[PDB]
Design a protein around this ligand. Structure first.
Ligand SMILES: N[C@@](CCCCB(O)O)(C(=O)O)C(F)F
Ligand SMILES: N[C@@](CCCCB(O)O)(C(=O)O)C(F)F
Ligand SMILES: N[C@@](CCCCB(O)O)(C(=O)O)C(F)F
Ligand SMILES: [Mn+2]
Ligand SMILES: [Mn+2]
Ligand SMILES: [Mn+2]
Ligand SMILES: [Mn+2]
Ligand SMILES: [Mn+2]
Ligand SMILES: [Mn+2]
Lengths: 308, 308, 308
């Protein structure tokens, strides 16, 4: 029951600033108090500081940042702590997943997101890296990436060992990439047809038939509907509701096999207040903005927080 | 993959004006671009222009309009195009369904609505025709209708070949008519108990056991909850949510047997903006009002639009 | 088909005033007209007027009020009327349940609530009685309660004959009490996993395997999500939605075994307007505040109100 907290305030994977403030905002809202009350011990490492493709925006900053995060997280993982990586945009998942994968070769990744993030630079509509991060992590890039030389000899994630859950906003080329690489995916329609519980059980059974693999959760908060999670840069209608995302995290916690996690794309500057209702019982700051509060509750779920 | 577009801006079936603007509003919002991107070809026919019961309001206008729509739609159906009929209030479904039925004698009708629209003139609380249209289409009227003489020798729809889905606001007399005529109906409670997916599968199995019949979809947008579809005249609490209505249209598309469709009761003057989120990816006008945008997305679903 | 209406405007179980106005507000909104239209006859009894634990707030007022309610309700129950007890805060359920239990020894109680209300005075964070009422009713109090001497020789409710449904906001000590006393409980997560329909069927099968016991419903309106029921003092995120709470009441009605019911924690002063949509068809006042209107609709469900 030891968790290493890493702040990864990288905002170079997408147009906006805001996500760089997420790590410190979650601390201000009561991250430490929340971990404390759940009976976990924490070590807060602070914040990470900061032939070829020529069409990825801000790639130098991203590459340099990613090397630092990779080295820092590798060191935390070796402690056999649960490692919590708080972004930052989804670009931080590359170093997070790959560092975890080098240590846990049989890692299974649950990528929770409204989007695929599975564009490659030659298909990206935006040139924004956070929309390509999963494709990069899966070894789908065809050329070398500037400032990622340090990563060229790493073992990459395999599509068959991955499940994407909650998707609903996929680009034309992405649809082809998704089908082609044979990754396991579960759309909001699958969730509507079968329910979130059956969906995650199906995903876990598919990627971990013997229920014996370590799990990495990469949670993009925009997987959650705008009604509950307005504090995020790229919104897609018809997301996971409050009950669903909480149950999902609870089920993953109950595997007892989660070793690491990203929580990405929380943007405090975009967030809104409700606020304070009696049900906000975790030691979270009164009247906190709703997405920030949700983030802390979802982290609590992963650490074992339950209704009774 | 050819669709005929018919605009049927009839607003005489209910008190309000507004629905007469729906057809041109959906065009303005990008109907043609949406059809184009889905790989369909369209032919836009433009807009329809315009002993006995003595208690149906505006019946002359409705009767004259309906003859025109019947003749126009009959001509489009004979092309073997998919025919998309955009209202207008639900009154336009009489000529739509009956023209389709004369060509496709084994037509099965899916009537998606918060309401039954199954009043007869002697039971109607309002005298508004759009609340009687289904009863009229099913041959339940007991007397002749002024200005509907042209229709008297048509074959009418049979209750056993029809399923009503999403109902929740039914008048006292309607409850009796519904049970008496033995139509297949699936209330919002059936949907809550079994889910939208099981519900539509059950309905399709009930009316088309051999999965070999052409299907007509009559979609009243007020079947969808007010949160997602405020742009409509008669709202009923507890409607289909965004995920449900999208999944429903997707499942119907996947039968590959839909030959015609109404989209009715969209009233732009009542609609609201969100607006523009990244997930609005179809070539729909930026910041479009939400019900109009939903209408275009649901039309896209019927034309094969899917998440991946 | 006779219902006795008892108004129990007790507001001493929790900090706020407001719930004392609930009984008269529901009457103003059309309680009598609603009962009339459903084919029931009513008798409106009006409103109840008004070694030891030393740490329960306002306990004198509560104790004196409860004796009056117990005596009044006992008299109504003996008529073999369905008895509808409208609070007031949840404190009124003690006398309601116990009076019903003395007459119906095999009573089964369905406690619908976001909260457990299962604190004992030595574990209560607030000293507010409405957060202890279920624990008191179940005979879990260890010391005597001032001004409750009249109740000391009553038969108490048994945990195994009770089901709590909808819970999501439980205090640390309550979690232990819940598990220890072996009460049947169904959290919002159970509801999300299985659906409200399966959940209530499971609960009824568990507490009444032979489907032959009289049922008491204790409905705290804060079980319903804030979106639909803002008019209440203690809100918890992720509640029952509009469709779910309506279906739940419908299923309980359909047992044909409900003999009594509480509707508690409605606070008109906290309520909001929508308002008037066509679907508000029950004889409820136009533009009524939404929680009040919901309360009347849920009472109607229990009295047999259905979609068709
Ligand atoms: N696919 C998009 C957006 C990706 C969203 C990133 B996220 O998961 O928060 C891209 O940039 O490649 C495209 F539409 F712009
Ligand atoms: N049944 C009502 C309303 C019908 C709603 C039409 B719709 O489906 O949009 C009627 O007019 O017969 C009645 F309550 F007024
Ligand atoms: N458990 C609480 C609140 C109870 C809510 C009562 B209700 O069901 O409306 C208590 O007072 O014991 C605590 F957190 F303050
Ligand atoms: Mn992402
Ligand atoms: Mn995303
Ligand atoms: Mn209609
Ligand atoms: Mn309707
Ligand atoms: Mn309560
Ligand atoms: Mn409560």
């Amino acid at each position: 029951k030891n968790v290493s907290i890493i702040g990864s305030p990288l905002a170079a994977g997408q147009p906006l600033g805001g996500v760089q403030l997420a790590c410190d905002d979650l601390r201000k809202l009561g991250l430490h108090n929340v971990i404390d009350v759940l009976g976990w011990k924490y070590e807060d490492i602070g914040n990470i500081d900061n032939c070829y493709y020529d069409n990825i925006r801000n790639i130098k900053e991203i590459g340099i940042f990613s090397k630092n995060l990779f080295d820092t997280m590798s060191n935390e993982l070796r402690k056999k702590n649960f490692v919590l990586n708080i972004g930052g945009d989804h670009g931080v998942a590359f170093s997070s997943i790959l560092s975890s994968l080098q240590m846990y070769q049989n890692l299974r990744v649950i990528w929770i997101d409204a989007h695929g993030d599975i564009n490659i630079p030659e298909t990206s509509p935006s040139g924004n890296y956070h929309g390509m991060t999963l494709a990069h992590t899966l070894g789908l890039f065809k050329k070398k990436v500037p400032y990622f030389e340090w990563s060229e000899n790493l073992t990459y994630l395999k599509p068959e060992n991955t499940a994407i859950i909650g998707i609903r906003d996929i680009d034309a080329y992405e649809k082809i990439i998704l089908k082609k690489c044979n990754i396991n995916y579960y759309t909001i329609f699958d969730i509507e047809k079968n329910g979130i519980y059956n969906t995650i059980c199906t995903a876990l059974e598919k990627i971990d038939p013997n229920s014996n693999c370590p799990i990495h959760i990469s949670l993009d908060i925009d997987s959650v509907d705008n009604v509950f999670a307005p504090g995020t840069g790229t919104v897609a209608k018809g997301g996971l509701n409050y009950r669903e995302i909480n149950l999902l995290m609870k089920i993953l916690a109950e595997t007892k096999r989660v070793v690491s996690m990203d929580l990405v794309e929380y943007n405090p500057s975009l967030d809104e207040v409700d606020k304070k209702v009696h049900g906000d019982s975790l030691p979270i700051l009164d009247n906190a903005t709703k997405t920030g509060k949700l983030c802390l509750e979802l982290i609590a779920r992963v650490l074992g927080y339950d209704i009774v």
